[PDB]
Design a protein around this nucleic acid. Structure first.
Lengths: 141, 19, 142, 100, 70, 184, 67, 112, 141, 55
RNA sequence: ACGAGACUCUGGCAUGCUAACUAGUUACGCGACCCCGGUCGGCGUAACUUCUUAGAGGGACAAGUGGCGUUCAGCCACCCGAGAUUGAGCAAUAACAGGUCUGUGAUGCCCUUAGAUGUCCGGGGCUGCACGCGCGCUACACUGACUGGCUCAGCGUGUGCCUACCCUACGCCGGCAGGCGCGGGUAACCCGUUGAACCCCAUUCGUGAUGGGGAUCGGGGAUUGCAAUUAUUC
């Protein structure tokens, strides 16, 4: 047996994005086409089905440490805003995308509101990450 | 105190009193 | 039967790794993930320097669980590098002879001294009149 | 009964010999005490220009003010503590006593 | 640099003959010799690898290296 | 045991020019896995010499402002450069490196003691300049160009290991030695 | 720059002049002798002094020393 | 001014033992010798002679400002041992700066 | 597959503006004044196009679908916050205004401020920086 | 009325609202740790407050 | 004798000392997930002080060895070692027509003192722009840009006397700046295990003033404030 922390995260997210895309019960809001993921982003994401990727990414960040609400998710996907000709600074991501993802991952019953606020992975979701860890750990042979 | 003054503020205000 | 445990740390800049030795099978893993995937990839063999200088026969009887805290990516690698090596040398000190400990310590230090000596360097403080420690602002004549 | 002394000072040696003299008082009357728990120092820092105007080379004073903070946890009757806390205290020291 | 965006009948033949017969195959080499855009060369050398005519050495974000087979 | 990037061995290469035997560190004790070490080489005067030339190249690469500190950017460039040198030459590229340090160093340089009397270089001054010339050979070739530094650094190390003169580092070297010949 | 000052040398002189019998060619004992026989107010000075004592005691084991 | 509870503050006004070794006690002594109308030379020696009697290791008394003329001029009076640099200054030397208002301008007293 | 298709228009003419038929379609359309990177992307989302194609490849019905969805972005569900001429002064209308329109409507926006004698237009007439700069040192011709 | 005018203009923020508790000056104000004392004023009273110069 | 040094603070070391529910670790147990172990910053308590904090000590002196110098002061190299010169603070005699009267209820003299040069209230201006200088920031790209993915800090500050204005987790709404309900923290207790950037890995671009660069300029939208236009800022 193996767990997600035993597996490379770079291709784990791509596998877990395929899984949530495959289920087809993730609930992507209509504006998922128009919206750019921050103010420190210039463009819309290149990959059209990003919300699945970020649901996977979010999901595995909720595995590694618990009780991480929406503010924390914008911080974990915060980045450098090139403030034009003024020097660049740290800028948070979109709250809205982080909040819809944590509504989606509770919809498809993978997470649930941890006590003292925030989101964590329910044992079903935890099993989904560890069984797909098994898939990806087996796939590199 | 009833408004509950900070420790760092307390040792500053104590020095300002002496001053 | 008995309890064979050694909690021995490694520093670089501000980065503290603590490697915890105990009896068992041959697994080293750092924050509970295996050495082969601790990013950055680029410094992969820098974590496998104690691994491949000694060979897994040295690490056969000992499984080491490392935690890392502080500094950056590079420093944290040089910390978890130094920790497992020092913690091993402290395991061969306590629970076997000096003979096995010394020929291990010899291999590590004769390769790279950093393995078993905490590099004393620290980010030297900034002074006013410049943008950093030594460097001064542009002087303007005329 | 679990009564908590919070010693705070500017000067070390003054607070070090007080926390020692309170832990004497805990051993002289022979009641259990968690030792002098060292809370981290607070370096308050004012970095002001030296010049009253701006008409010299840009020098700066770097004032500090260290605030050392110790705490002593006792398993004591309240009156023994209000007796010991009165005995031999000096101006460098600042003593709180929390009941519960 | 009046490069080609997509292949001709001619240039695609020159590629499918010559580029298997190189020792070092990089997009920046194939783009530099066949007078094509780098991006088009990156797609062409991903086709040639799917056709099993070239051998991947080190695929990296920056530098992708291919070789011959013989 | 087996060495550099897990795949480039040490006991294949021979330092030909005995002038640079001690100042080209590449052999037996200077066999490291990565060209990345804390080092503290640049503390006392000559300890610079007991740094593996692969790590000196790596360090010498990260230049023109933006790149200073980005050593993993250069560690990577050197790794991909050696892949290219192997696949274009069929050789342990540490030998192509050492051949390039031997060839691409100036052996006599002008100095101000009138017009600039010619003197001889230190062997360490030669190794220092060698690595400078063929790193600037790479980055200047690669600047405003479709080619990568992997290719440009490789092409520089290859042309230098030959003495092709298409090498920036050989062309600037024999120019320096021409100007040194002049004032003699 | 590791030249020793007058307050180090003058001390070391007078220490040997009065207590030659207790001193030797071992730093860590000479260091501990200086503690006993003199109020040196500083550890660094205490070592500097002891350190020059040891250096003089080597020069005494050879021919005679001037001052 | 400080809003302490009514009768929850008590002022005592005790005496300095060996008052010669307090700088601000000698600076205030000096400023009231000068404002008394005594010649600056006399007053400064008078202080300096007093504190060296009182049992001080050294003494630096400076009176900057306008003596005799419009030109600003320092009169520096020194004797004994006086250190300037490094920590011991913080607890060995006692330093005082005081103003005095003469009818012509401001003289300053630096007792050290 | 990766060869030049026949009827490859090397120079399109879309909204009477010469578009390069070599560029990617998200970065070719930007040549038209009024459409940038960010806008063109979300137009090529609504116009369900594989935007991986170059500017010549896609068909005349596909580019005339691109025209219509740029001209009427509000109708094909690109929201009001995503347009360049939001809540316009003459008609109260939200609409992305394109090349010759944007120039003719820029002309009007300055020629309004010139006519009403408003500080902003007076700055424009005298050929000066308007948006609160310091002209003492910068803006030197 | 003048009683309405005289002090009408609000003094709730900005360096015209706060001043030095010593100097009574609208400049070089050290607000940190509730000093509110002028940068010249605090440089005179730093010792008396307990602000030693060390590093 | 002062200045230098010493000195004070600081950087680096001690499985040696004193210690700890506002700091933890290792055990043990309960529990979640994987096929006996493995993961857990999931929960709880027994030991303990390695990491943690801060106190007392110790530690390094050219002390050891080898080389040129009465073999003086010392210098250079090496062994052992956490270091074989960490950084600052302090800082002499005597000066300067250095700067400050716009830091001061520090102040001499002169001016003004009710149609004020006091003071307050409203309104500009302090930013006005052919041009010349000075410190800067961002850049010119492919050691790059863009989009995702991954993953590590240390100084710190934080609810105010007057003083009005604090740091913020958490849950909804919004594309976003932001708005809304709703708690914690006067602090090793909460923000916070401060999930920072550069870096790392994976797509797209391809030598084109190009997806480099982001100035000017149009329209719209939010916040602080009594008020933003000569665009506060976003």
């Amino acid at each position: 047996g193996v767990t997600v922390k035993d597996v490379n995260q770079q291709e784990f997210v791509r596998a877990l994005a395929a899984f949530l895309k495959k289920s087809g019960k993730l609930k992507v809001p209509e504006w998922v086409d128009t919206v750019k993921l921050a103010k420190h982003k210039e463009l819309a994401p290149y990959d059209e089905n990003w919300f699945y990727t970020r649901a996977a990414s979010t999901a595995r960040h909720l595995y590694l440490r618990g009780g991480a609400g929406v503010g924390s998710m914008t911080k974990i996907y915060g980045g450098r805003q090139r403030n034009g000709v003024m020097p660049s600074h740290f800028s948070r991501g979109s709250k809205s995308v982080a909040r819809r993802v944590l509504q989606a991952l509770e919809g498809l019953k993978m997470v649930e509101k941890d006590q003292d606020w925030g989101r964590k992975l329910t044992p079903q979701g935890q099993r989904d990450l560890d069984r797909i860890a098994g898939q990806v750990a087996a796939a590199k042979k | 105190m009833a408004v509950q003054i900070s420790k760092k503020r307390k040792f500053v205000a104590d020095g300002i009193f002496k001053a | 039967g008995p309890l064979q445990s050694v909690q021995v740390f490694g520093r670089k800049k501000t980065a503290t790794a603590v490697a915890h030795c105990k009896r068992g099978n041959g697994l080293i893993k750092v924050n509970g993930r295996p050495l082969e995937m601790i990013e950055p990839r680029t410094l992969q063999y820098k974590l496998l320097e104690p691994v491949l200088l000694l060979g897994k026969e040295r690490f056969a009887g000992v499984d080491i669980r490392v935690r890392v805290k502080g500094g950056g990516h590079v420093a944290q690698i040089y910390a978890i590098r130094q920790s497992i090596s020092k913690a091993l040398v402290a395991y061969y000190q306590k629970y076997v002879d000096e003979a096995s400990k010394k020929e291990i310590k010899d291999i590590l230090i004769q390769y790279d001294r950093t393995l078993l000596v905490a590099d004393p360097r620290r980010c030297e403080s900034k002074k006013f009149g410049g943008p950093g420690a030594r460097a001064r602002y542009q002087k303007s004549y005329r | 009964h679990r009564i908590r002394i919070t010693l705070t000072s500017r000067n070390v040696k003054s607070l070090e010999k007080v926390c020692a003299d309170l832990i004497r008082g805990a051993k002289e009357k022979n009641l259990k005490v968690k030792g002098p728990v060292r809370m981290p120092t607070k370096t308050l820092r004012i970095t002001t220009r030296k010049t009253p105007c701006g008409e010299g080379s840009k020098t700066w004073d770097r004032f500090q003010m260290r605030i050392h903070k110790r705490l002593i946890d006792l398993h004591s009757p309240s009156e023994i503590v209000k007796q010991i806390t009165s005995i031999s205290i000096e101006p460098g020291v600042e003593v709180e006593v929390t009941i519960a | 640099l009046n490069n080609l965006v997509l292949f001709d009948k001619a240039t695609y033949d020159k590629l499918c003959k010559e580029v298997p017969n190189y020792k070092l195959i990089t997009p920046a080499v194939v783009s530099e010799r066949l007078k094509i855009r780098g991006s088009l060369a990156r797609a062409a050398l991903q086709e040639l690898l799917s056709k099993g005519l070239i051998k991947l050495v080190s695929k990296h974000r920056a530098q992708v290296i291919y070789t011959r087979n013989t | 045991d087996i060495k550099l990037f897990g795949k480039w061995s040490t006991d294949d290469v021979q330092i030909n020019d005995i002038s640079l035997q001690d100042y080209i560190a590449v052999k037996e004790k200077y066999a490291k896995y990565l060209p990345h070490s804390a080092g503290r080489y640049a503390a006392k005067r000559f300890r610079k010499a007991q740094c593996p030339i692969v790590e000196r190249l790596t360090n010498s690469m990260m230049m023109h402002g933006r790149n200073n500190g980005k050593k993993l950017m250069t560690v990577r460039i050197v790794k991909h450069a050696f892949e290219i040198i192997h696949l274009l030459t069929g050789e342990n590229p540490l030998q192509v490196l050492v051949n390039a340090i031997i060839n691409s160093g100036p052996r006599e340089d002008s100095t101000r003691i009138v017009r600039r009397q010619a003197v001889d270089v230190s062997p360490l001054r030669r190794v220092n300049q060698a690595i400078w010339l063929l790193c600037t050979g790479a980055r200047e070739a690669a600047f405003r160009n479709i080619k990568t530094i992997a290719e440009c650094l490789a092409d520089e190390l290859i042309n230098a290991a030959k003495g092709s003169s298409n090498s920036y580092a050989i062309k600037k070297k024999d120019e320096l030695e021409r100007v040194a010949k002049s004032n003699r | 720059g590791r030249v020793r000052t007058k307050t180090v040398k003058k001390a070391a002189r007078v220490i040997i002049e009065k207590y030659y019998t207790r001193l030797g060619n071992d730093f860590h004992t000479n260091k501990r002798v200086c503690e006993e026989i003199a109020i040196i107010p500083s550890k660094k000075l205490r070592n500097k002094i002891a350190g020059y004592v040891t250096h003089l005691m080597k020069r005494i084991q050879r021919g005679p020393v001037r001052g | 001014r400080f809003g302490f509870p009514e009768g929850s503050v008590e002022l005592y006004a005790e005496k300095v033992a060996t008052r010669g070794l307090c700088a601000i006690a000698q600076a205030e002594s000096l400023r009231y010798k000068l404002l008394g109308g005594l010649a600056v030379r006399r007053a400064c020696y008078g202080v300096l002679r007093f504190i060296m009697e009182s049992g001080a290791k050294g003494c630096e008394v400076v009176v900057s400002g306008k003596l005799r003329g419009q030109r600003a001029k320092s009169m520096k009076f020194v004797d004994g041992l006086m250190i300037h640099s490094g920590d011991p200054v913080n607890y060995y030397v006692d330093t005082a700066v005081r103003h005095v208002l003469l009818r012509q301008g401001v003289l300053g007293i630096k007792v050290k | 597959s990766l060869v030049i298709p026949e009827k490859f228009q090397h120079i399109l003419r879309v909204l009477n503006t010469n578009i390069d038929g070599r560029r990617k379609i998200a970065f070719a359309i930007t040549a038209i004044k009024g459409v940038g990177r960010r806008y063109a992307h979300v137009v090529l989302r609504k116009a369900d196009i594989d935007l991986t194609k170059r500017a010549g490849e896609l068909t005349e019905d596909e580019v005339e679908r691109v025209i219509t969805i740029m001209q009427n972005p509000r109708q094909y569900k690109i929201p009001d916050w995503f347009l360049n001429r939001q809540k316009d002064v003459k008609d109260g209308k939200y609409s992305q205004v394109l090349a010759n329109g944007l120039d003719n409507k820029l002309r009007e926006d300055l020629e309004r401020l010139k006519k009403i004698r408003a500080h902003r237009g007076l700055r424009h007439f005298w050929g000066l920086r308007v948006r609160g700069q310091h002209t003492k040192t910068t803006g030197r011709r | 009325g003048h009683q309405q005018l005289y002090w009408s203009h609000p003094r709730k923020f900005g360096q015209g609202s706060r001043s030095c508790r010593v100097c009574s000056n609208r400049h070089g104000l050290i607000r940190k740790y509730g000093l509110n004392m002028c940068r010249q004023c605090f440089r005179q009273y730093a010792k008396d407050i307990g602000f030693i110069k060390l590093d």
